[model samples]
Target: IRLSALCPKFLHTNSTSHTWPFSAVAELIDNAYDPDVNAKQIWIDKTVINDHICLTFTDNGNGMTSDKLHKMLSFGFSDKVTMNGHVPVGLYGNGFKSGSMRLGKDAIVFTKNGESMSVGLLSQTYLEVIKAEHVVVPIVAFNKHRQMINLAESKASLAAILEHSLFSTEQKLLAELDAIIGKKGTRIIIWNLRSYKNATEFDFEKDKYDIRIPKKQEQIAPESDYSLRAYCSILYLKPRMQIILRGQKVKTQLVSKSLAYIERDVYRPKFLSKTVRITFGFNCRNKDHYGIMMYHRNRLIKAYEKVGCQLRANNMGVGVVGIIECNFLKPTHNKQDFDYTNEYRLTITALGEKLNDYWNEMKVKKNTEYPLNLPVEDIQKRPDQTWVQCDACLKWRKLPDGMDQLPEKWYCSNNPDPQFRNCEVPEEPED
Candidate 1:
C-alpha cells in the first residue's frame, strides 16, 4: 500500500511520466537471472485487448516461498543484489509494483517448487484499503490469499501462460528474453495491453551528413546549413563559497566550470558549443528526455535531439543539455549573446581533439574582416574561399566506423549545401 521511492517529485504532476508497464516485469525476469536464481529460464507473453491489455511474466530461476513472496511484494523490501551477489534490475522494490500499477489494475503471480504451488496477486485497489489511516499509529496488517491455478493434471496456470506453441511472435520474443536471461533461470510471460511505451515509441533518430562550408563571396547566409557548426564552451555559474582570510572578504571559487563541462559535453557532436550548462534531472525510465538545447550564439534556438537523451520529446518537454569548452563555439560572448554561427559544428566525430581543430577554423572566421552588425549565427562566404573540403565536412565523408555512426537517419546535409550531395554513399560508381 505504501507509495514507492521510485516515484520522483515531478511524477504526480504528469501521469504519463509513470508509463513503463513491462519495466516491472522486466525487473522480475532479471531477478530470476541474478546469481541467486541458479535454476534457468525466465519467460513472458502478451494477450492483446482493445483498451485493456494483459502482460504475464514468469521465471523458474527460483520459486519464492510464502514468506519470501510476501516480503518481495512489500515496499522498501530487501536488496536482492546484496543477498544474491548480483544486483537485480528490480533493485528498486518499487519497480515491479509501481510499474505494474502503471499498466494494469492487478498483477497475478503463481510460483512453484517441486510439486508445491503458491499463488500471489498484486492490486492497487486492494492496497488502497490499508492506506486510509486516520493516524499513522498502529499499522494495519493483511493476510495472504491463495487459489490453486493448476494442479497435477489440472494444467497449472504457470504452464498455460508459458505456452508459446500458440503464437509465433510471442515465441520469438520468448527466445530473445531467454537468451538475455539465459537458459537455467526464470521463465516470465507479461501481457502488456496497456499501450505502454517501448523501444519504438522511445526512438530518437541519430543522423550525420557532410556539407561543404562554401567560401562566401560576401554577405553571410543564415539559412545555410553549412553556416552552422556545433559549439561547446563554458561560462561562470556564480561566485565560489566565501572563506575568512584575514578579516577581508576572501573565498575560493576555482575556475571549475571547465572541468564540469568537459566531463559532460566533450562527447556529443551537436551542441559542441557549450554556451551554458543546464543541470536538472527528470523521471524518464526510458526514451531520451535530454539532449542539445541548440543556441545561436547564446540565444535558445531549439532542442537538438540526440542519442541516450529522452524527454517525452515527441511532443514538448524540458530535457538535459550538454556544454563543450571551446573559444569559438561559445554559445554566448561575455555571457550574453552567441558570438557567431561559425562557432558551432555538429558531427559525431567532433569529439575531444577534433573539437579543437574545428574551434581553430571558427576563430579564423571570427577574427577576419566581417560585418559587425551581421548576425554571428549566419554562414559567411569568403571572397577568396575556394572549393577545398572543410575538415568538418570531410570528417563525415569517409565511411562511418559502424552502422551507428551514420547520421543520415537524423538530418540531411544537402540542398542548403550542394557539396554534401557527393558525400552521400553512392549507389554505383562509373568505371
Candidate 2:
C-alpha cells in the first residue's frame, strides 16, 4: 500500500501562503538553479493563445524522465543532491506544486533526457471536473520516434492530457517537447493564470520585453515586489546563470564596486569563531533603496532588509546598503526570510553597529560639504576602551584571554595572570 497520499485541493490552499506573486516566481527560478537541475540558462516568456495568457519557463538543464516526473508530482520527498561542492538550494519537495499553482490553475511540463520525452500535467480543473478522489498526475512518454513507449498507465494518462490540458492533440504535446532546444532540457507552460478584473495580474503592455504588475490606485511598494524583472536581477548574490525575461536579458548589479562609498567590514560571531565579511555601501541610483541583502549559498534569502537603519532613529543610515553571505544562519522552508533565532538577532545588531560607523565616516571624512547635504544631529564617536577593577589593589585590571566581559568581582587570587595573581607583588605602574 502507498504510505502517503496528497489531496488535489491542498495544492491550491498551500499556494495561498504566497501573498506576493514575485515570491512565487522566485520559487520556480530556484528550482532550475538548484544543483540537481543545474540549468545554465532559463528563459521566461509570456504569450497569449486562445484568449488565454500563458507563462512559459524553458531551461537548459538536467531534465527528468517519465518516472522522475511522476515522483516530482508526489508530495514530501527531497532527494538532496550536492555536486562539486555546490550546496542544493531546494531542501523541501513542495516548491513545484505551490509555485506553479499560485500562478495558474493548470501547468504542463515537457522534458527530454536524451533517451525519451515526457509530458506531465498538474491540473486543478481536471481534478475538479473528474471529481477525483486522489490527486492523480497525467504523465506520458514517447521514444525517439512518434511511437508511445510501454510505460505503465500510458494510454489513460495520454487521453487525460489530450482532453483536459491546453495542448489538445498528440501533435501539440510533441511540439512542446521540441521547445526544449537540446537533447536534455525542460519546458513548463502554465495556462488559466490567476487574473485581476478582466486581465491577468501582470501588465505585458507596459514594456515589450518586460513583465510588470499593473499600477494600483495607491501604489507605493518597491519595484522588486511587483516586477519579475527587478526581482530576478537580485535573486542571486553571485549569478552564474543568465535569465532572459520576455526575450530581454536581465542586468544584475549587486555587492561591492557597484555603489559609492564602499566599505568592507569583517563580522566575527561572539558565540562562534566563524568570521563573516560584509560589504557596506550607499545605493547609487535609488537613494530610497537601502538595507542589507542577505544570501545563503549564493541565493538571496532576504532582500532589502532594513536592519541597520531600522533600529536607528532619524534615518541615521539612509541610502546605506550592505551585502552579506550568511551561510551560518538558517532560512525558512520558502527562503523568503530567515528564521527568528539568536544568531539572526545578533547578526542584525552587529550590522546595525557597522552601519552606524560607516555613516559616521562617510559624512565626516568622505564628503567635503557635510554641513550642506549630510547633517547628523546625533554624532557618534567611538567609546574609550576600559577594563575591570581588581579587589586586592582597588586598581583596574584586565581579565583573562578570550574574555570580553567582566566578572562579578574579580579578585587578585584568581586573576588569570600569574604575576597579578600574587597579592604581595608590586602593582605595575601605568604606562
Candidate 3:
C-alpha cells in the first residue's frame, strides 16, 4: 500500500491530537539527540516575530545534505535503526512533521552540511492541498547553490534570500544562522502559534510552560510537584546528563535524596523475564509529590501513574514514592501511559505486594501496634477504651484497657521522620 496515499486529515488528526504541548516540544529535542550525532548543544527559544509567537529549535548535529533532507522528510522513513547497540530517540521520521504541525500551521527547516545549505517548508496551506485533492505534496526545498545568489555579487542579496525563505525579520534567527553558517547542523523555525495556556493536557496553570529547564540560579518553588527539571533528573539512570536552559545549566532538586531508608530492589516477574528495578522512599514534598514513576526505554512514560497499590500511610500524608524501570511494558501511541495488559497487571500486582511487605516491616521496626484479628464488633464492645489515636502520626492505635491517654509529648513508632516527634494533643474539656 502507498503510505503517501493516506488521507491528509489523518495527518492533521494524528499530528495535532493525542500529544501535549510539552510532549510535542520534547519530540523535537529527541530528534536532536540521535545516538550517532556529535553535536551536544541544542537550543530552544520562544519569542514573538512580526506580531506572531514563534518557536525555534536549533541543534549542532551533523547537518543534512539536500538529498538527505529530501529523504528525511518522507513519512515513515528513518535512518536511525541501531548503532553500537544503542537505539536512537527519533526512530520515526514523522516526529518532525507531527511535532511541528501540532505546535503551529507553518514550519521551516534550515540545515547546513559544510558549505552546502538547504531550506524546506511544511505549511498548512500546502497540507490542505494534499487533503483536498487527495494528493501527496512533496516538501519543497531551496538549496544553497541555487538560492544563495549574492555570494559573488553582493552579501545583501543572500540576506534577502534568507529573509524570503525564513519569513522572519527577527535578529535572533539571523544571529543563530550566522553562528552555524559554515557549520553542520539543523534549525527548525515554527510560527503561527497555538495557545497552550488553557490546555488541559498538562498539570501546570495557564501560561505556565510545563516543560521548563530551570537554571542553577533560578529559584523554583520548594513545594512544586511536576517541575520539568525534576522529571528530567530521573529520565535516564545511566550516565546522567545535565540540561541547559536559556544559556543557564538547570539544576534538578532531588526531593527524595534527603529521605533515608529508601528501599531498592530488582525482580523479574513470572509474566516477563526482564529484570525490573524498583526504588521506593518518602518524597520530601509529601502528598504534593508522591506516586510511582514509570520509565520505559530511559524515558518517563508517566511521572505519576495511579497503580492503586496499597501501602501503610497516614491520612494527611502520602505513604511512599516509587520508581519502576522495566522495558517489558509497552508505551501507548502518545507514549503517555502503559497499555495495562494482563501482563502489566500481573507485574504491578506483584510489585505492590513487595512494597506492602516492605512497609509492614518498617512499621514493625517502629513498634507500631495494630489489632490483627479483632473485629469491629470486638472493638465496639470496649468503644472509647480500646481505640486510641496518636497525636504524632495521626493514626488510630489499639491500646490496652487502662492506657487511656498517651504521653503529652510522644512520637508514633511508625513516624518516618526520626528527627522529630508529634506532641500536640486535642485538648479535653473539664471531666
Candidate 4:
C-alpha cells in the first residue's frame, strides 16, 4: 500500500504558536533532557539580531550525527527509541519541529559530536517551496572540517547557506558556535518570530512568565504569575538538572518549607496494579499558597490543583502542599495537566484523607489553647487564679507558678512568642 502525505498548510498549522513563548523554550529543554547524553549545563540566551528577535538554546549533550539530524527534521520521524531506552514525553516526533516552527518562521540546529558536526534548517519559506515544486523537504548536513566555518574567516550568508550550503551566517551566529558547542553539544537558533497582536518585548532577565491562578483576597498584594524558574524547579522528573537563563541560575523553589507535619507513602490501588508515591505536608512557610501539585515521570503536570475533599472543603483552610509521583498516569499533549482516571482519582482521594488528618491534628492542638483575640478581662470568668496577661496580645493565659525567681514579664501560650515565657510573678505587694 502507498503511504499518504500531510498537507503543507495543515502540518504548519498543527504546530501552531504556543500559549506562551516560554512553553516553547521548555520543549527545547525537554529535548535536551530526553537523551542520555552528558548534558550538565543548558544555557538560554535571548537577544535581537538584525532587528529580528532571536532565542538561542545551548546544551552540552551528545550532539546528533548527520542521519539523526535529518530524522529530526522529518515530519513524523522520531529518534527517541534508538538513542535511549528511557521513555520520552515527546514520543510523537513532532516536539522539536512544532515547538520551533510555532515560534518563528526560521529555525536552525548546529550539532557537534566528537569530530563530526551537522547543521539543519527548517524554514517555512522552504516548506512552501517544497509544496509548490512537489520536491522533498531538504536538510543539508556538513562536518566540522569541511562546511562549518568561523565567522571571521570569510563573509557568508545564512540565507545563502539555506539555499546552497549547509550552514547559516547571521553574524555573531557562527562566531559563537565554537564557544557554545565547546567539546560537544547542540545549539538551536529560532528567529524571525511570528508576531502576536499583544506580544510584548520579552525580557529574559525579568520576565518569569509564571503560570498563575485567580488572585485570592488574602494575598498581601496581588500574587505574581508563577515564575518559570519557580515552576521549573518542581517541573522536571528530578531537581538535578541545572538551567541558566540570561545570567542567573534557575533554582527549584521548594514547596514544603517549615511544615508542622508531613507524611510520605507509596499507595498501590487494589483494582489497578499501578502504584503512586505521595508526600504531603502542612504549615508551610507560605501557607497562604494552597493546593496540591502533581507530577508524572518527574515533570510537573499541575502547579497547584485543588484535589477536592478535605483540601477544598476545609473551613480553616490551612495550607497543604503535596507532590504525587504517578508514573502510570499520562500527561496531556501539552504536558499541562494529567488525565484524571479512576486510578488517579483514587490515589488523590487517599492522599486527601492523609491531608485531612493533618488539618484535624492542627484543630485539636488549637482547641486547648487560649484565644489570643479574646478580651483580657475574660480570664476572670475562669476559677484559675494563676492566669496572666500577655505583653503583646494582652490576652490572659494559664501561667506556671513554680519558677525559681519572680519574672518581670508574662506572655500567653496562644502566641508562639519563643522570646518570653512564664518567668516570675511579682514577689512584692503594691501599696
RMSD of each: 19.9, 16.6, 15.2, 14.5
Give lDDT tens digits, candidate 2, residues 262-372: 677899999889889888777755666678889998888776777756555536676778889899898874787888999999999998888878877877774564555
Per lDDT, the best of the predicted structures is 2
Sorted by lDDT (best first), the order is 2, 4, 3, 1
Worst 10 residues of 4 by lDDT: 376-385
Alpha-carbon TM-score of each model against the true structure:
0.32, 0.82, 0.65, 0.70
For each candidate, the alpha-carbon lDDT, in order, equals 0.32, 0.77, 0.54, 0.57
* Candidate 3 TM-score over all chains jointly: 0.65
What's the CA RMSD of model 2 in angstroms? 16.6
Of models 3 and 4, which has the larger lDDT?
4
- How many times do residue backbones clash in model 3? 0
- Strongest candidate by TM-score: 2
- Order candidates by TM-score, high to low: 2, 4, 3, 1
Per-residue lDDT of 86-138 in model 3, one digit per residue for the tens? 56656667777788878776777777776666656655655563445452323
Report the C-alpha lDDT of model 4 over 208-234, residue by residue, as the tens digit: 433222222233421323355555555
Spell out the clash pairs found in candidate 4.
158-169, 210-226, 236-298, 237-298, 407-424
- Runs of candidate 1 with Cα error greater than 4 angstroms are 1-17, 20-25, 38-40, 48-53, 82-85, 124-431
Determine which window of 10 residues in candidate 2 has minimal summed lDDT: 377-386
